[PDB]
Amino acid sequence: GTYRGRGVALTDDEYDEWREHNASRKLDLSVEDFLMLRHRAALGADDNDAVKFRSWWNSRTKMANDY
């Protein structure tokens, strides 16, 4: 996967789609946080924020797991 904190630009879609994540989940989250949520979901970590991200994002998009 990508990274976090290191000026992460993330894969092309998901970063832009994070701006949508901000909208849809009615939060005001930074990309790093997003990248984590998707990271865990995509890769194989099940931290609840990431799983609730998964649930929401995978009913609609189902991302582009660092593709």
UniProtKB/Swiss-Prot annotation:
PTM comment: VPg is uridylylated by the polymerase and is covalently attached to the 5'-end of the polyadenylated genomic and subgenomic RNAs. This uridylylated form acts as a nucleotide-peptide primer for the polymerase.
Annotated spans, Acidic: 12-17
O-(5'-phospho-RNA)-tyrosine: residues bearing it: 15
Domain of life assignment: Viruses
Function noted in UniProt: Viral genome-linked protein is covalently linked to the 5'-end of the positive-strand, negative-strand genomic RNAs and subgenomic RNA. Acts as a genome-linked replication primer. May recruit ribosome to viral RNA thereby promoting viral proteins translation. Interacts with host translation initiation complex to allow the translation of viral proteins.
Recorded domain comment: Contains a compact core domain in the N-terminus half that is composed of a three-helix bundle.
Subunit composition and interactions: Interacts with capsid protein VP1 and protease-polymerase p76. Interacts with host IEF4e; this interaction plays a role in translation of viral proteins.
Protein name, per record: Viral genome-linked protein
